[PDB]
Swiss-Prot record, chain A:
Main location, first listed in the record: mitochondrion
GO molecular function: structural constituent of ribosome
Subcellular location(s) of the protein: Mitochondrion
Protein name (record): Large ribosomal subunit protein mL55
Keywords of this entry: Mitochondrion, Phosphoprotein, Ribonucleoprotein, Ribosomal protein, Transit peptide
Domain of life: Eukaryota
Any GO CC annotation of this UniProt entry: mitochondrial large ribosomal subunit
Included range, full protein: 34 to 78 of 128
Quaternary structure and partners: Component of the mitochondrial large ribosomal subunit (mt-LSU). Mature mammalian 55S mitochondrial ribosomes consist of a small (28S) and a large (39S) subunit. The 28S small subunit contains a 12S ribosomal RNA (12S mt-rRNA) and 30 different proteins. The 39S large subunit contains a 16S rRNA (16S mt-rRNA), a copy of mitochondrial valine transfer RNA (mt-tRNA(Val)), which plays an integral structural role, and 52 different proteins.
Coiled-coil regions listed in the entry: none
Family the entry assigns: Belongs to the mitochondrion-specific ribosomal protein mL55 family.
Taxonomic placement: Eukaryota, Metazoa, Chordata, Craniata, Vertebrata
GO aspect biological process, one term: mitochondrial translation
UniProtKB/Swiss-Prot annotation, chain C:
UniProt name for this protein: Large ribosomal subunit protein uL18m
Gene Ontology BP term (one): rRNA import into mitochondrion
The keyword Transit peptide belongs to this UniProt entry's keyword annotation: yes
Oligomer and partners: Component of the mitochondrial large ribosomal subunit (mt-LSU). Mature mammalian 55S mitochondrial ribosomes consist of a small (28S) and a large (39S) subunit. The 28S small subunit contains a 12S ribosomal RNA (12S mt-rRNA) and 30 different proteins. The 39S large subunit contains a 16S rRNA (16S mt-rRNA), a copy of mitochondrial valine transfer RNA (mt-tRNA(Val)), which plays an integral structural role, and 52 different proteins.
Function of the protein: Together with thiosulfate sulfurtransferase (TST), acts as a mitochondrial import factor for the cytosolic 5S rRNA. The precursor form shows RNA chaperone activity; is able to fold the 5S rRNA into an import-competent conformation that is recognized by rhodanese (TST). Both the cytoplasmic and mitochondrial forms are able to bind to the helix IV-loop D in the gamma domain of the 5S rRNA.
GO cellular component, one term: mitochondrial large ribosomal subunit
Assigned protein family: Belongs to the universal ribosomal protein uL18 family.
Compartments where found: Mitochondrion
GO molecular function: 5S rRNA binding; structural constituent of ribosome
Top-level taxon in the UniProt lineage: Eukaryota
Gene: MRPL18
Keyword terms, alphabetized: Chaperone, Mitochondrion, Ribonucleoprotein, Ribosomal protein, RNA-binding, Transit peptide, Transport
Curated annotation (Swiss-Prot), chain D:
Name of this chain's protein: Large ribosomal subunit protein mL48
GO cellular component: mitochondrial inner membrane; mitochondrial large ribosomal subunit; mitochondrial ribosome; mitochondrion
Domain of life: Eukaryota
Residues of the full protein shown: 48 to 190 of 212
A GO biological-process term: mitochondrial translation
Protein encoded by which gene: MRPL48
Subunit architecture: Component of the mitochondrial large ribosomal subunit (mt-LSU). Mature mammalian 55S mitochondrial ribosomes consist of a small (28S) and a large (39S) subunit. The 28S small subunit contains a 12S ribosomal RNA (12S mt-rRNA) and 30 different proteins. The 39S large subunit contains a 16S rRNA (16S mt-rRNA), a copy of mitochondrial valine transfer RNA (mt-tRNA(Val)), which plays an integral structural role, and 52 different proteins. mL48 is located at the central protuberance. Interacts with OXA1L.
Curated annotation (Swiss-Prot), chain F:
UniProt subunit comment: Component of the mitochondrial large ribosomal subunit (mt-LSU). Mature mammalian 55S mitochondrial ribosomes consist of a small (28S) and a large (39S) subunit. The 28S small subunit contains a 12S ribosomal RNA (12S mt-rRNA) and 30 different proteins. The 39S large subunit contains a 16S rRNA (16S mt-rRNA), a copy of mitochondrial valine transfer RNA (mt-tRNA(Val)), which plays an integral structural role, and 52 different proteins. mL40 binds to the major groove of the anticodon stem of mt-tRNA(Val) in the central protuberance.
Coiled-coil spans in chain: none
Cellular compartment(s): Mitochondrion
Gene that encodes the chain: MRPL40
Family: Belongs to the mitochondrion-specific ribosomal protein mL40 family.
Name of this chain's protein: Large ribosomal subunit protein mL40
Taxonomic lineage of the native organism: Eukaryota, Metazoa, Chordata, Craniata, Vertebrata
Tissue specificity note: Ubiquitous.
Record organism: Homo sapiens
RNA sequence: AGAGUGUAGCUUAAAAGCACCCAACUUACACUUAGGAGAUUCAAUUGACGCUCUGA
């Protein structure tokens, strides 16, 4: 059960868009995160 | 009464990969993204997309597409590590990567004389030994590896006592932090099981009732 | 002309009426009472009643309260009762189902306010 | 009245408690105050998971002192939520921690660190 | 000089050492419920009340409501809160089922039993219907406890009731 | 230090004119309603499952401590003793793609 | 194999009332408001269907 606290929404009302940008830190490990300017993937060098 | 003093352990693998979603959770997630968009408040990404092409229409009447295209192709560059090393193997029961989204439980054959039983891994304890220390000794004994597990407490989880000389069987619950599980093709018969094969591999009442303290999720 | 119990000023609700409309919203059922000061229930209408229950979708919603308001009001016109007091809690006052209940009662023929005592 | 049998029928201040180390004495053992830090790159998953933790704790009869949040950091931004807990059992330490383990959505980490 | 209480004191059994382990009235409404229940209980001190006081049915009913909630317009109308209720069906079926107990309440409230029979209560099983002629067009009905003028009641009324001898009395 | 970050950024005031348009249809709100209804069904079934697990496992460990108490009266005293290894206890959340 | 048995979670409730879940206000909880799902194991007080405990 890793999907309960995932079905979310921004509970604020003074918020801009967020976009499900897949992030990798260094390990080829993708996580869906919401960030400004709809990126599709990330890597921290 | 001479008690055959038996300790044991029930080993857990925490899933590194998340579970897939319900289709109802799919429709609800899509709905939350729609209604989440509906109440947002002027993201600068669209301010650098919507009004900019309006101003370019004003300049032509008298780049966001490149950013999206680069993000799309760079999305096409890095392939995803596949969440399924599960159906291709299909018989690597000894391997730690048999499943990724569920819990995995250690489970070892034991050959006795009066019995011959496929058992959740045990040990034999001494009154001097701590029960937690019995399970700590149980960790790096039977597998013959360099794992790194983790317990929680000296509280047990599931007790089953069978006789034929008195006896008792105590079931703890550990949790694998990491594993330097050297030479996974052992001579031992450790098998990692999700939940369903525990009702397959383990028939009797002292073993068909382990799943009521296995974290089923 | 009859006395109302004038007193009871530190305590909710006021006992100063002749007839009270008391709504009992349970988990499953909406319920509506018409009582004296005695506590003698004069006229009731619940959804725990086959005549009203079967024509409803759910026994607890705003439709249940408008229904039980029509039914309660029609039952009270034929009891010679024309004046209740309804005293809600300030959240039950601003609920939709009790505004709908009150609109059902007033449109039904019952004034939810008693005439004063003539001294 | 002080001499009647109904004396003190109206008293109520013994019914309101109008008012830290761990208590592990000899038989009845319990943790002190705790801290559960929730760090994520998402406001949504951290807040919502803190909700799920908080509603578990209210649904299992645990004193939850605070549920505050820590300030974020310039890095991407890392978000934190602190949901304090005081008082568990031996069995309830295991059973309570296994669900918080087995309910994490996506990449959000835990802490069973205590106060100070 | 203390004298000990006669029966049990209130707030005795819930009085424990760990109040913080006891779940509390989170609301106003729950306290009002429990509080009214304790008001209605018989006590030993002096109180205000001293001085100022088969299977086929559930089968067809379960299948009947189960058929009732299955229609799409009933759910869609009820969620848009424009669904209503026919008052006539409820009226006639009320005349059939539980009407007699309610007419028993109205006869007890209006003191018909303490005066008409010295307290010998009974249940009006027959759904009687009496109405007075108001000219030729319409007619004033008599329900339990109505107001009717003696001009409307100048002439003897029409009595209709569904039954099978009888003696009627006013 | 009482500095938090629930304070709203000042930029979210002026240009609030991108989406004043919120219009739907009947069947969109009908399907939205059926998602909320059947999703409360789904979530309720979930907490029935988890409550069943906490009940089952909690009774399992209490029965275990009873048997361990009645078969070893010097081990149920130490079964209650807590571990000092659970002050810095951590676990990171799951991922998608293995390294 | 025997014994205890039996309404949805609980009921010396008789198809009820509290429990329960989602949605909204809340950091969140709580309150409140809008909704949701519910049951008397099957046949004649009696037997036989499902559970628990004691057996081999």
């Amino acid at each position: 059960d890793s999907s309960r606290a995932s079905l979310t929404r921004v509970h604020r009302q003074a918020y801009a868009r967020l976009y499900p940008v897949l992030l990798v830190k260094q390990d080829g490990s993708t996580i869906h995160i919401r960030y400004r300017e709809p990126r599709r993937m990330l890597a921290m060098p | 009464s001479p008690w055959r003093l038996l300790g044991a352990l029930c080993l857990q693998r925490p899933p590194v990969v998340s579970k897939p979603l319900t289709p109802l959770q799919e429709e609800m997630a899509s709905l939350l993204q729609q209604i989440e968009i509906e109440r947002s408040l002027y993201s600068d990404h669209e301010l650098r997309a919507l009004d900019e092409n309006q101003r370019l229409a004003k300049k032509k009447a008298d780049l966001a597409q490149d950013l999206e295209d680069m993000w799309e192709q760079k999305f096409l560059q890095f392939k995803l590590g596949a969440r399924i090393t599960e159906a291709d193997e299909k018989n690597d029961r000894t391997s730690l990567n048999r499943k990724l989204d569920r819990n995995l439980v250690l489970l070892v054959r034991e050959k006795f004389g009066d019995q011959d039983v496929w058992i959740l891994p045990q040990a034999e304890w001494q009154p001097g030994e701590t029960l937690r220390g019995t399970a700590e000794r149980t960790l790096a004994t039977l597998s013959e590896n360099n794992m790194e597990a983790k317990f929680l407490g000296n509280a047990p989880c599931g007790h089953y006592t069978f006789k034929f000389l008195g006896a008792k069987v105590f079931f703890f619950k550990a949790l694998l932090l990491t594993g330097d599980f050297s030479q996974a093709g052992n001579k031992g018969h450790h098998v990692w099981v999700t939940k369903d094969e525990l009702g397959d591999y383990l028939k009797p009442k002292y073993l068909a009732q382990v799943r009521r303290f296995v974290s089923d999720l | 002309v009859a006395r109302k119990e004038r007193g009871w000023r530190t305590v909710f609700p006021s006992r100063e009426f002749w007839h009270r409309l008391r709504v009992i919203r349970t988990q499953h059922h909406v319920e509506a009472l018409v009582e004296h000061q005695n506590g003698k229930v004069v006229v009731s209408a619940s959804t725990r009643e086959w005549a009203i229950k079967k024509h409803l979708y759910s026994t607890r919603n705003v439709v249940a309260c408008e229904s039980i308001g029509r039914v309660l009001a029609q039952r009270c016109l034929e009891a010679g009762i024309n004046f209740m007091v309804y005293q809600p809690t300030p959240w039950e006052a601003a609920s939709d189902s009790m505004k709908r209940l009150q609109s059902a009662m007033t449109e039904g023929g019952v004034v939810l306010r008693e005439p004063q005592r003539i001294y | 009245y002080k001499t009647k049998p109904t004396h003190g029928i109206g008293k109520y201040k013994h019914l309101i408690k109008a008012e830290v180390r761990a208590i592990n004495l000899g038989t009845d053992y319990e943790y002190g105050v705790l801290n559960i830090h929730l760090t994520a790159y998402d406001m949504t998953l951290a807040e919502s998971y803190a909700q799920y933790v908080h509603n578990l704790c209210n649904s299992l009869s645990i004193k939850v002192e605070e549920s505050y949040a820590m300030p974020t950091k310039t890095i991407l931004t890392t978000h934190e939520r602190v949901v304090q807990i005081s008082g568990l059992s031996a069995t309830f330490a295991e059973i309570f921690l296994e669900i918080i383990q087995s309910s994490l959505p996506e990449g959000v980490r835990l802490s069973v660190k205590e106060h100070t | 000089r203390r004298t000990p209480p006669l029966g049990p004191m209130p707030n005795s059994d819930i009085d424990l050492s760990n109040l913080e382990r006891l779940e509390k009235y989170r609301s106003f409404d729950r306290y009002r419920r429990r509080a009214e229940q304790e008001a209605q209980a018989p006590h030993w001190w002096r109180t205000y009340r001293e001085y100022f006081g088969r299977t086929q049915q559930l089968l067809e009913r379960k299948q009947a409501i189960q058929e009732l909630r299955a229609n799409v317009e009933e759910e869609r109308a009820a969620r848009l809160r424009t669904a209503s209720v026919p008052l006539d069906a409820v009226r006639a079926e009320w005349e059939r089922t539980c009407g007699p107990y309610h007419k028993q309440r109205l006869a007890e409230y209006y003191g018909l039993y303490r005066d008409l029979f010295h307290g010998a209560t009974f249940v009006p099983r027959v759904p009687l219907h009496v109405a007075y002629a108001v000219g030729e067009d319409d007619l004033m009905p008599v329900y339990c406890g109505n107001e009717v003028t003696p001009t409307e009641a100048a002439q003897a009324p029409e009595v209709t009731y569904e039954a099978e001898l009888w003696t009627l009395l006013l | 230090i009482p500095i938090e970050d629930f304070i709203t950024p000042l930029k979210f005031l002026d240009k609030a004119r991108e989406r004043p348009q919120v219009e739907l249809t009947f069947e969109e709100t009908e399907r939205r309603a059926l998602l909320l209804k059947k999703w409360s069904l789904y979530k309720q079934q979930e907490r029935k499952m988890e409550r069943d697990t906490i009940r089952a496992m909690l009774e399992a460990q209490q029965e275990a401590l009873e048997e361990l108490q009645l078969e070893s009266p010097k081990l149920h005293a130490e079964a209650i003793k807590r571990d000092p290894n659970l002050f810095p206890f951590e676990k990171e959340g799951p991922h998608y793609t293995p390294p």
